[PDB]
From a paper:
Eukaryotic SOD1 is a 32-kDa homodimeric metalloenzyme containing Cu and Zn ions at the active site in the active state. The protomer of SOD1 forms an eight-stranded Greek-key β-barrel fold with four conserved cysteine residues and three long loops (loops IV, VI, and VII). The Cu and Zn ions are bound at the active site by loop IV, whose conformation is stabilized by the highly conserved intramolecular disulfide bond between Cys57 in loop IV and Cys146 in 8th β-strand (β8). Eukaryotic Cu, Zn-superoxide dismutase (SOD1) is primarily responsible for cytotoxic filament formation in amyotrophic lateral sclerosis (ALS) neurons.
In this study, we determined the crystal structure of the double mutant (C57D/C146D) SOD1 that mimics the overoxidation of the disulfide-forming cysteine residues. Aspartic acid mimics cysteine-sulfinic acid in terms of the electrostatic charge and the atomic arrangement. The crystal structure of the C57D/C146D mutant SOD1 determined at 1.8 Å resolution showed the metal-bound SOD1 dimeric structure at the active site, which contained one dimer in the asymmetric unit. This result indicated that the metal-bound SOD1 was crystallized despite the small portion of the metal-bound form in the protein sample. The metal-containing state of the C57D/C146D mutant SOD1 adopted a similar overall structure to the wild-type SOD1, with an RMSD of 1.311 Å between the protomers (residues 2-153) of 152 Cα atoms. Notably, the loop was disordered (chain B) or significantly displaced from β8 containing mutated Asp146, resulting in the open conformation at loop IV (chain A). The open conformation of loop IV in the mutant SOD1 was distinct from the wild-type and the previous C57A/C146A mutant SOD1 structure. Charge repulsion between Asp57 and Asp146 appeared to induce conformational differences in loop IV in the overoxidation-mimicking mutant. The open conformation of loop IV in the C57D/C146D mutant protein indicates the increased monomeric and flexible nature of the cysteine-overoxidation-mimicking mutant SOD1, which is consistent with the MALS results. In the mutant structure, the arginine residue is disordered by lacking the interaction with disordered or displaced loop IV, as observed in the hCCS-complex structure. This increased conformational flexibility of Arg143 in the C57D/C146D mutant may account for the low catalytic activity of the metal-bound mutant SOD1.
Author numbering: -1 to 153
């Protein structure tokens, strides 16, 4: 089987929630990521795929950012990045982040497959590895998880 579409329902302990859609018509092509997230503070919020689709214990059970190539944290456009580094979503004045992303590193098939893994929206902006500290090189200093969910097959 080869997934062409995926979906992730994001939920948390507070007001943050949303639906994220993934589309990839070609196995060797980019993934379109689109949807909306509500209940956010206005501004930038870190947006990452973590390694495991698990919250057995909590944040640790989702593991670090998905990182099959053993690289350091960066932005989605950087050559040096984790596969799960999708950068930041932007929330407007009403707390709605309209997500519109095209990425060529994540995939719905193969070694970079994100199906069965966890998508997370964070409290703070992702510094893209440019924060000048150790945490920047791992998480981008995006802080706590406001909402998460496991990425499932949709088509
Ligand atoms: Cl760029
Ligand atoms: Cu994260
Ligand atoms: Zn990362």
């Amino acid at each position: 089987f080869m997934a062409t579409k995926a979906v992730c329902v994001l939920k948390g302990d507070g007001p943050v929630q949303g639906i994220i859609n993934f589309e990839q018509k070609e196995s060797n092509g980019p993934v379109k990521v689109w949807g909306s997230i509500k209940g956010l503070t206005e501004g930038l919020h870190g947006f990452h795929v973590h390694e495991f689709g698990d919250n057995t214990a909590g944040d640790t059970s989702a593991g670090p950012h998905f990182n099959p190539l053993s690289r350091k944290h960066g932005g989605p456009k950087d050559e040096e990045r984790h596969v799960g580094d999708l950068g930041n979503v932007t929330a407007d004045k009403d707390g709605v982040a309209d997500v519109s992303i095209e990425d060529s590193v994540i995939s719905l098939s193969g070694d970079h497959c994100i199906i069965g893994r966890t998508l997370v929206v964070h409290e703070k902006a992702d510094d893209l590895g440019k924060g000048g500290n150790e945490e920047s090189t791992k998480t981008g200093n995006a802080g706590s998880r406001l909402a998460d969910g496991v990425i499932g097959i949709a088509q």
